[PDB]
Amino acid sequence: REIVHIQAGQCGNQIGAKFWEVISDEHGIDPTGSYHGDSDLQLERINVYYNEAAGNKYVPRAILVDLEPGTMDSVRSGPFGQIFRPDNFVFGQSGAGNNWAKGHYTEGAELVDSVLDVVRKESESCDCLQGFQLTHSLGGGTGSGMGTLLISKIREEYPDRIMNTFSVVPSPKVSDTVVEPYNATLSVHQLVENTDETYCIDNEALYDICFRTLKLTTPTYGDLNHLVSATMSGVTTCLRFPGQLNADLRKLAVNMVPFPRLHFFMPGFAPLTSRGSQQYRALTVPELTQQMFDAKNMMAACDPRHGRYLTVAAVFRGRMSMKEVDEQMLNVQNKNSSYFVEWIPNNVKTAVCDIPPRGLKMSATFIGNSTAIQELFKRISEQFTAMFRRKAFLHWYTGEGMDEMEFTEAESNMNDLVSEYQQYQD
Amino acid sequence: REIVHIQAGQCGNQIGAKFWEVISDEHGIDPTGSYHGDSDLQLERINVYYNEAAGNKYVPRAILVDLEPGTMDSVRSGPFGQIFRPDNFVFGQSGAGNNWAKGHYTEGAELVDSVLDVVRKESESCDCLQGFQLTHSLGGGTGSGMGTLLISKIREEYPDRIMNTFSVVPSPKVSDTVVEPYNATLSVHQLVENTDETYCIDNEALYDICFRTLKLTTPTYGDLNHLVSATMSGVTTCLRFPGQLNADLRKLAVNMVPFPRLHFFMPGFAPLTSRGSQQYRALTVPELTQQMFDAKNMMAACDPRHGRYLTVAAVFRGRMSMKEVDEQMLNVQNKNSSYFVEWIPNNVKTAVCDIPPRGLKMSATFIGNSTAIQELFKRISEQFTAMFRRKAFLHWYTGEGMDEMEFTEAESNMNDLVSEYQQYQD
Amino acid sequence: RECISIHVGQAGVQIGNACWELYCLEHGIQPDGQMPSFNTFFSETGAGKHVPRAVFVDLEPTVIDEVRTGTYRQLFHPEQLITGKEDAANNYARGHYTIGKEIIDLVLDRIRKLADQCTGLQGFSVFHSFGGGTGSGFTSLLMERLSVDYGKKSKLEFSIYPAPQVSTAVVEPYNSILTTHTTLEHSDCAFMVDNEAIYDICRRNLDIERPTYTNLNRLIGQIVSSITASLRFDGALNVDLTEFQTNLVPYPRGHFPLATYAPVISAEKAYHEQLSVAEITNACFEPANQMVKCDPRHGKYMACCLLYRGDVVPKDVNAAIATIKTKRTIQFVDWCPTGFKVGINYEPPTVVPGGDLAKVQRAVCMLSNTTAIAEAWARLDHKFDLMYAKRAFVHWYVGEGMEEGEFSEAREDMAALEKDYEEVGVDS
Amino acid sequence: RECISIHVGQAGVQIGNACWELYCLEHGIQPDGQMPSFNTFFSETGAGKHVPRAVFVDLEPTVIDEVRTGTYRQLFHPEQLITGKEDAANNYARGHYTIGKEIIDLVLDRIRKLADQCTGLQGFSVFHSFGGGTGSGFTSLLMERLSVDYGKKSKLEFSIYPAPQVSTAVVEPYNSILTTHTTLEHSDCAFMVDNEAIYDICRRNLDIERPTYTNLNRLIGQIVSSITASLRFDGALNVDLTEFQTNLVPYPRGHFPLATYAPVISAEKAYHEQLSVAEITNACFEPANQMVKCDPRHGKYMACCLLYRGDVVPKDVNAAIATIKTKRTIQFVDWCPTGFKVGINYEPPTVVPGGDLAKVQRAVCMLSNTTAIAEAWARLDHKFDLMYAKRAFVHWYVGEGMEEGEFSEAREDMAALEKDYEEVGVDS
Ligand SMILES: *OP(=O)(O)OP(=O)(O)OP(=O)(O)OC[C@H]1O[C@@H](n2cnc3c(=O)[nH]c(N)nc32)[C@H](O)[C@@H]1O
Ligand SMILES: *OP(=O)(O)OP(=O)(O)OP(=O)(O)OC[C@H]1O[C@@H](n2cnc3c(=O)[nH]c(N)nc32)[C@H](O)[C@@H]1O
Ligand SMILES: Nc1nc2c(ncn2[C@@H]2O[C@H](COP(=O)(O)OP(=O)(O)O)[C@@H](O)[C@H]2O)c(=O)[nH]1
Ligand SMILES: Nc1nc2c(ncn2[C@@H]2O[C@H](COP(=O)(O)OP(=O)(O)O)[C@@H](O)[C@H]2O)c(=O)[nH]1
Ligand SMILES: [Mg+2]
Ligand SMILES: [Mg+2]
């Protein structure tokens, strides 16, 4: 029944800053820590993410990890940085510098032991864990590097808990680190087989949505990470709150994974349009389904109609008829039958929660597992190869002891995921 | 049951500005978007042209298209530009310049893909489309050029929907573009076989009516486009509102087209006289029929008594007896038997709606398909030939890749319509 | 002893509106169905509400919506009110085939439901118009199914006869020609009236120069009620609908009895004038009260049925008949002796409150089959021919799957029909 | 004369919520249990509070919490409300095995406690859904134990039939195939309904285009009450649950009678219309009121049971039967003569205050076993096959200890079942 969340890397720490904000919004918990809500449900299932400390203080069940105090400090300095206890800030001193080898292989490795100890302390604080969630970037040093290391140890300690992670996937246009594909390649090599599932977030796609449908001209990462948190929070609240359908994360995982190795997801979100049009929108189930199916409302820079859909999850929040939902999903399946895989009859699955997100009447979360995902892997693998041959920045990595044959195997493994998507693309 | 309207070119955009104004007048919809009427019927069939967006906002089911933001902006700046959603403004940057080649063949072609995507989004928003309507100029770059391109694709997607268009036909005296007949020729070549029907509006004739019977000395295009919208709105309201006769657009199309290729129409309108005489007018069915038959009340610079009438539609708005209408139409047929074609017994058909246009007790719309129409084609074809031989401005067109043999075929096709009118003129 | 009314198309439904209004007037039926008091047409609920056993079909929502928003919206069961979204467009090709054929199954199942509600289905009658898309297109489609399921039940049709001078439908000849082809062969009897002729009646007998359809249909309703309400009510000679068919249809082709109705008199014209049964029947043989513009003196009679309301004594009727048989110029076909059906109901004639016709104490309806009808077909023949020779408007049917041969064929069937009239005219 | 209701899973519990609400409506039971007035279902306390003899199982706290916070939280005994912490995840492998198997012992002991409270346990019935983790997983687990302890008691199951078009559970075929394998062999009879078909009923007979599960379950509750409340109440022909089994199950396989219910009528549709027993039963043989999307005309009937509420006279029933036997197109299997069980209760039909269905004075429930069910299995066969051929989602079961052979086997068992339907279809 409970979940532990660990954030890492500057990305992960800033995403989590919005995530937790939202969760407390959902439950009426004040930036200082106490509960000042107003709904029974708000406290009722609070356990999944909060420990109530003496005084009616709620402690977010999460660990903030970094290798630079300053980022942690900036998190702590805002509202909701006060709700986190000092003991959840685990950090070192001297960066990682966006270096996998430092993060995973060497220096960051040193910190992980202290992180894990706190993890253990929290695992004991829970009655019964459902699982763990981690937030991070695929091409980052602590985000992926150190984060991955941690994941391999947590999974080891808890094989029976859900291990998932959401991660920022290097967008085709904006890479920061020259070896960002290298770090990503290494994380695939480690993560894929050490996780139950991973979500693919593309900032470029997010920037398109924010202007494309939301028509906004000023977003920052906090605004885009709001959208990220909308999908993350969407998933777990249902599990938390009363609904109609089947509201268990593990069951979601079961329904979305047809094969042990292909567990990559494309998140999307509805409704998600500018205020101008809000006066011209109608709120129906087909309306949400139109926004959910549309590739432009995906947060991943993929194109599901290019690939084939293996699995689709449609999560609904708010009062909807069962009939309408059933029929519209069927219609989707029918009309987009050319994209769905024939091996899975009725490949579109649903989940229904009766609690709407604060401020909306209804909402829906799109989760997909298509073959289209392989295109991201292909882009990375290719870029990787070029760098691999030149050893760009690999003296930094090999200087910290990372061996090229390990990287070679990582490359293969990327290619293996692509070939397996091809094996089920048919 | 529903209709989608697309406006294009400076002409089309300004005509539509009046058209939609009128439609909202008909239904009591405020310039800001909400419904503030007062009749049951006003909302009852609103679906054909409006989507009700959340908040009791009505969205006109139309797309505004241009290649210059400034025209679009001017439309948006007035009342009823606020009722259109931003998503219905599809435009590029850099004109067309009244160049078919740019509009259709090259640059404007690029925009059409985004237009069509929105079209598709609206086609899904409808329950069941009856058809589509487009407003444009025959000699214009985006009006005809880009507009035509769009039509060919919409027809392709929806063979089973009505495709009609109203278009400004180059008046004998006022052409703006030197190659306006060229653009028109090309549009015939493309449009005629890619449309179910097209209406022929002559500004010169309109300027004569406004002074001839309306005795006005200040009109602008907004006043003349009011008259245009009177005929357009006249047609669709009946379809929308309760009547006596047969109020379906497709049925109108069926009754007015005797031959696959000859679908050109001459709109006219009654009552349509100055206020002075309004104190000396009587309102009877023969009164309307006198105004309807009279060639001077036609909006097309043709002369129906010069040619032969193939089909006539008389649409009536307001309470009239069936007897009177039947008898007067018969009388018309009888007295003007020398103009009607002998192959079609009882060539004058009627349609009756019981809802009068706001402010009038009664009104009638004249729609005709005569052979006289061919005279317009003849004027254009001739002018075309001269230009064709000289290639006036064709370096602009051939510079954008338009081939002269395509134009040659276009010329033939114009001549073919004339010969077919002759074939049924007898 | 039950029957079903079917209203297809605007004409069918708007006429029906008048018809059911009149039936309400016949018994004091409230808009909500409450009747304080004719179960041959109506089905009773435990609230004492009665439902008119009828089906309303329109492929365009509007007219049915007009019903749905009027007073009789409470009377009609929502399932009786059937509507599509799109029209036939004046066109058999869509009415019978492309469009109407999609909804007809629903329509039939509502009919069948009512047929199951009937305990002794005597039969039914269909109200429509010869020129329209649903009016004639869909209509024949229905007959195609109804004649299978209800093969032994009365199949009476009532249709508006296309006015020779005014018609709003340019392809009406084509529509009507196609219906001939398909209705002749399926229906039992089709009746028709001419709105132009009716206008002349309104202006000469009612003195009204402003008739609308809402006037015109009241007059039609009168005629219909004489044969529908009063034939179920008590009289001397209670004539059934099956009896009507058995007394009006002489050949297995169709036949097309035309309506004539006298009295049609304005209130002022009723003053100072005393009608007798005989005088009313004299009026019935006058061209002037002929409801179709076709000259009674041109053709020869084959059938004739006179139905009486109110103060009618058979004694007087007998005398009247004697004079119409011998005094008039009514030529009749050899085949027929003058066995004219006399229906005599004690049930008085009724008048619509706020209507044009005067309160009368007695009334006579006349049905007649005359050879002059071939001229009506001749009218259609040339109108069709003209269009068809030029092939004007042909693409509006061809695009829906119609065949040119079919159209020729249908004309030929009409020609055959005309020839059979020719045959009957030849006395033998 | 007692029985136990078992509600497993959301579907089981939320349907149960409607069911127990209806039983409260049947007798005027207050939320606190106070009843001023059916002890076959209820157990009485000295306060005059009655406890519904039922068990509620959910492995996720939420739905039971919904009960615990609603009005009926006072009605239910805290021990009846059993909850785990984690879910089955749509998955038999956890529902039947890994997770649900841990709590089941508790569940069984509460059942046994109630069995000891029963003095004359007639039997019980289980409410669930064919696709879910607890809905079908846990459910079959329970049957495995209940069939041992209560081997001679009624084992009736009610389950939601997976909609062919909409399903939220991608591995539902796999779940349902596994249940077939294990339920066929243990249960006595399983009934099922299709929410999609129900939607069509709601929109056509109730005229509602917005059905939620809380509407859908009211309709289900109606059907259930006819066979649960009214079978314990007085009538002419008082039919027991064991009698139901003894009159509905023809073979030792299972059988799967499907529900049909007529009247399902909106208040406005009830006006102006008089239903008789015969008319209601006519509706019962119409595809249109079939609660499962499966065509009654496709298959052949094997069993049929008609249960009557309110104003039903056997006299009329007899006539109705005669016509359904002879008038209809109902083909039936040789094996069977038409011995259709007629249950006739004087107990009137009841309606939920604020519901959609009209107050009716009489009502008929129909159970039927048709050969068309094999097509439902065919649907599952291919859906399963597709997934299984690709081995999509297989790791979610394998990781819990499931065997691939087992899955093949379960499919084969389904195939055998289809073959037995084939067999029955062959007349002999
Ligand atoms: O709309 P569609 O063509 O699909 O079906 P219809 O309803 O048959 O078409 P419509 O064009 O309305 O048919 C018109 C013919 O019928 C006459 N008519 C219309 N409404 C009438 C009415 O209320 N009463 C009478 N007596 N006649 C009516 C028209 O004159 C025309 O011939
Ligand atoms: O949660 P878990 O999978 O472990 O158990 P379930 O409760 O069986 O799962 P769930 O996913 O909710 O099963 C859903 C199936 O049952 C239908 N359904 C849900 N709730 C329903 C209700 O209240 N009434 C009806 N009639 N059907 C209900 C869903 O359509 C789905 O097929
Ligand atoms: N959405 C999102 N992406 C971020 C944020 N911060 C850094 N990123 C992305 O993360 C990548 C850089 O890795 P970084 O987080 O600096 O690594 P680390 O800090 O060394 O672990 C780039 O692709 C950025 O676009 C953020 O707050 N939101
Ligand atoms: N009635 C009418 N004609 C117009 C309007 N605007 C331009 N026109 C006519 O359109 C022709 C010019 O084409 P234009 O609309 O400028 O082409 P485009 O803007 O490049 O697509 C001329 O014949 C004008 O008389 C208008 O608002 N009303
Ligand atoms: Mg559940
Ligand atoms: Mg009509």
Per-residue HEC secondary structure of chain D comes to CEEEEEEEHHHHHHHHHHHHHHHHHHHCCCCCCECCCCCCCEEECCCCEEEECEEEEECCHHHHHHHHCCHHHCCCCCCCEEECCCCCCCCHHHHHHHCHHHHHHHHHHHHHHHHHHCCCEEEEEEEEECCCHHHHHHHHHHHHHHHHHCCCCEEEEEEEECCCCCCCCCCHHHHHHHHHHHHCCCCCEEEEEEHHHHHHHHHHCCCCCCCCHHHHHHHHHHHHHHCCCCCCCCEEECCCHHHHHHHHCCCCCCECCEEEEECCCEHHHHCCCCCCHHHHHHHHCCHHHECCCCCCCCCCEEEEEEEEEECCCHHHHHHHHHHHHHCCCCCECCCCCCCCEEEEECCCCCCCCCCCECCCCEEEEEEEEECCHHHHHHHHHHHHHHHHHHCCCCHHHHCCCCCHHHHHHHHHHHHHHHHHHHHHHCCC
The two tokens of residue B97 are 């310049």
Element (H, E) at A291: helix A285-293
- How far, in Å, are B263, B285, B287 from residue B292 at the CA level? 20, 10, 9
Residues of chain D with Cβ-Cβ distance to C117 below 8 Å are: 279
> How far is A174 from A178, CA to CA, in rounded Å?
10
Evaluate whether B231 touches B331 at the Cβ level (below 8 Å). Answer: no
Cβ neighbours for D188, distance < 8 A, ≥ 6 positions apart? D154, D155, D156, D245, D249, D254
CA C171/CA C175 separation, integer angstroms: 6
What is residue A90's three-state secondary structure?
Answer: strand
- A95 labelled ligand-binding: no
β-pairing verdict for B363-370 and B309-317: antiparallel
> Per DSSP, what are the bridge partners of residue A349?
A313
Chains C and D touch (3+ CB pairs under 8 A): yes
d(CA C256, CA B246): 26
Give the pair of three-digit tokens for residue B218.
């200040």
Instruction: Please answer yes or no on whether D274 and C45 come within 8 Å at the CB atom.
Output: yes
Please report, in angstroms and rounded to a whole number, the separation of the first and last CA atoms in chain C: 39
Q: How many residues does chain C have?
A: 428
Work out whether strand B57-60 and strand B50-53 pair parallel, antiparallel, or are unpaired.
antiparallel
- Superfamily (CATH H level) for B1-258: Tubulin/FtsZ, GTPase domain (3.40.50.1440)
B278-301 CB burial, b ≥16 within 10 A, e <16: eeeeeeebebbbebbbbbebbbbb
CA of A370 to the centre of ligand 2 (A): 26
Nearest of D125, D112, D128 to residue D3 by alpha carbon: D125
What's the CATH class of domain B259-372?
alpha beta
Which tokens hold the place of B344? 């079609």
Q: Which one of C86, C210, C390 has the shortest CB-CB distance to B424? A: C390
> Which residue lies with its CA nearest to atom 15 of ligand 4?
B11
3-state secondary structure chain B: CEEEEEEEHHHHHHHHHHHHHHHHHHHCECCCCEECCCCHHHHHCHHHCEEEECCCEEEECEEEEECCHHHHHHHHHCCCCCCCCHHHEEECCCCCCCCHHHHHHCHHHHHHHHHHHHHHHHHHHCCCEEEEEEEEECCCHHHHHHHHHHHHHHHHHCCCCEEEEEEECCCCCCCCCCCHHHHHHHHHHHHHHHCCEEEEECHHHHHHHHHHCCCCCCCCHHHHHHHHHHHHHHHHHHHHCCECCCCCHHHHHHHHCCCCCCCEEEEEEECCCCCCHHHHCCCCHHHHHHHHHCHHHECCCCCCCCCCEEEEEEEEECCCCHHHHHHHHHHHHHHCCCCECCCCCCCEEEEEECCCCCCCCCEEEEEEEECCCHHHHHHHHHHHHHHHHHCCCHHHHHHCCCCHHHHHHHHHHHHHHHHHHHHHHC
Specify the residue for token string 């799967």: D256
- How far out from the chain centre does Cα B315 lie? 16
Q: Which atom of ligand 4 is nearest to the CA of B175?
A: 23
Nearest one of A97, A135, A94, A124 to A111, comparing CA atoms? A94
Nearest CA to ligand 2 atom 2: D133
Identify residues after which chain D is interrupted (C–N over 2.5 A). 37
- Eight-state DSSP code of residue C125: E
Closest partner residue to B244 (CB to CB) among C10, C86, C88 is C10
Is residue C110 within 8 Å of residue C51, measured between CB atoms? no
Tell whether ligand 2 has an atom less than 6 A from the beta carbon of residue D63: no
In 3D space, the residue among B151, B138, B32 whose CA is nearest the CA of residue B376 turns out to be B138
Encoding tokens for residue C425?
């005219």
CA–CA separation, B59 vs B80, rounded Å? Answer: 10
In Å, what is the CA distance from C305 to each residue of C191, C257, C367, C374? Answer: 13, 9, 5, 20
- Out of D185, D243, D279, D409, the active site residue is D243
Phi, psi of A87 (to 5 degrees): -70, -15
Domain boundaries, chain A: 1-258, 259-372, 373-426
Distance in angstroms (rounded) separating the CA atoms of residues A272 and B19: 31
Token pair 């998933």 in the structure block, residue: A235
Please state, in angstroms and rounded to a whole number, the distance separating the CA atoms of residues A86 and B262: 83
Calpha distance A264→A250 (Å, rounded): 15
Method used to solve the structure: cryo-EM
Backbone angles phi, psi at C46, to 5 degrees: -65, -15
Neighbouring residues of the ion ligand 5, judged by CB less than 5 Å: A 246; D 10
> Which of C35, C86, C30 shows the shortest CA–CA distance to C59?
C86
CA-based torsion, C380, C381, C386, C390: positive or negative: positive
Give the other-Cβ count within 10 Å of C310's Cβ. 18
Q: Which residue, among A61, A83, A37, has the nearest Cα to A127 in the 3D structure?
A: A61
Tokens at residue D337, please?
């003569």
Q: Is A65:A8 a contact under the CB 8 Å cutoff?
A: yes
Q: Which two tokens stand for residue C318?
A: 């007998």
* Owner of token pair 């002037």: C288
Binary contact (C168, B241; C-beta < 8 A) = no
| Among D181, D165, D200, D222, CA closest to D22 | D222
D243: annotated active-site residue? yes
Chain C partners of B250 at a C-beta cutoff of 8 Å? 86-87, 89, 94
Q: CA-to-CA distance for B33 and A410, rounded, in angstroms?
A: 58
Q: Are strands D189-194 and D154-161 parallel, antiparallel or unpaired?
A: parallel
Lookup: tokens for D292: 């499962």
Give φ, ψ of B124 to 5 degrees. Answer: -70, -35
CA-nearest of B388, B234, B214, B195 to B297 is B214
Cα–Cα distance for residue pair D108/D90, rounded to 1 Å: 22
How many CA atoms lie within 13 Å of B36's alpha carbon, on the beta-carbon side? Answer: 5
Report residues whose beta carbon is within 6 angstroms of any ligand 1 atom.
Answer: B 244-246, 251, 322; C 9-11, 14-15, 87-90, 95, 129, 131-135, 160, 162, 167-169, 195, 213, 216-217
The structure tokens listed for A187 are 């994380």
As given in the structure block, the two tokens for residue C306 are: 């006179």
The strand pair at C341-345 and D42-44 is best described as: unpaired
What is the arrangement of strands in the sheet containing A264-270, beginning at the earlier edge strand?
Answer: A89-91, A62-66, A2-8, A129-137, A162-168, A197-201, A264-270, A363-370, A309-317, A348-353
Q: How is C270-316 classified by DSSP, letter by letter?
A: HTT----HHHHHHHHTSGGGBSSSS-TTTS-EEEEEEEEEES--HHH
Closest to C125 measured CA to CA, from C105, C112, C138, C139: C139
Neighbouring-strand partners of residue A81: none
8 A C-beta contact, residue D83 and residue D60: yes
Q: Which CATH number fits domain B373-426: 1.10.287.600, 1.20.1070.10, 3.40.50.970, 3.40.50.2000?
A: 1.10.287.600
**Chain A residues touching D383 at Cβ < 8 A:** 344-346
Long-range contacts formed by A91-95: CB under 8 A, 24+ apart? A91/A64, A91/A65, A91/A66, A91/A67, A92/A66, A92/A67, A92/A68, A93/A67, A93/A68, A93/A69, A94/A67, A94/A68, A95/A67, A95/A68, A95/A141
C-alpha to C-alpha distance for A91 and A94, rounded to whole angstroms:
9
Compute, in angstroms, the gap from residue C129 CA to the centroid of ligand 1: 6
Structure-block tokens of residue C104 = 């007809």
d(CA A26, CA A20): 10
Interatomic CA distance for residues C282 and C185, integer angstroms: 35
Residues 7-66 of chain C with CB under 8 A from chain B are 10, 14, 60, 62-63, 65-66
Q: Are the C-beta atoms of residues C194 and C291 closer than 8 Å to each other?
A: yes
To what resolution in angstroms was this structure determined? 6.5
Helix (H, G, I), strand (E, B) or coil at A321: coil
d(CA C58, CA D133): 49
Q: Hey, what are A412's tokens?
A: 């293969």
Q: How far is the C-alpha of C114 from the C-alpha of B209, rounded, in Å?
A: 58
D88 lines ligand 2 (CB under 6 A): yes
CB D221 within 8 A of CB D22: yes
CA A261 to each of CA A193, A375, B53: distance values in angstroms, whole numbers, following the listed order? 7, 16, 44
Q: Which helix (H) or strand (E) holds A230?
A: helix A221-240
**Backbone break loci in chain B, preceding residues, C–N > 2.5 A:** none
| Half-sphere exposure of residue A408: CA atoms within 13 angstroms, side-chain side | 4
d(CA D194, CA D131): 12
Q: Is B318 left (phi over 0), alpha (psi -120 to 50) or beta?
A: left
Which residue is closest to D275 within chain C, CA to CA? C45
Could you say which residues from 19 to 58 on chain B have a Cβ atom under 8 Å away from some Cβ of chain A?
33, 51-55, 57-58
For residue B207, give Cα distances in angstroms to A240, A323, B22, B135, B301.
70, 58, 21, 19, 11
- Comparing CA positions, the residue from C334, C378, C336 lying closest to residue C249 is C336
Backbone angles phi, psi at D289, to 5 degrees: -115, 15
CB atoms within 10 A of CB D220: 26
Give the CA count within 13 Å in the CB-facing half-sphere of A312. 29
Query: How deeply is D191 buried, as exposed, middle or buried, from its count of CB atoms within 10 A (0-12, 13-18, 19+)?
Result: buried
**Chain C residues lying within 8 Å of B333, measured CB to CB:** 165
**Shortest Cα distance, chain D CAs vs residue C78, angstroms:** 7
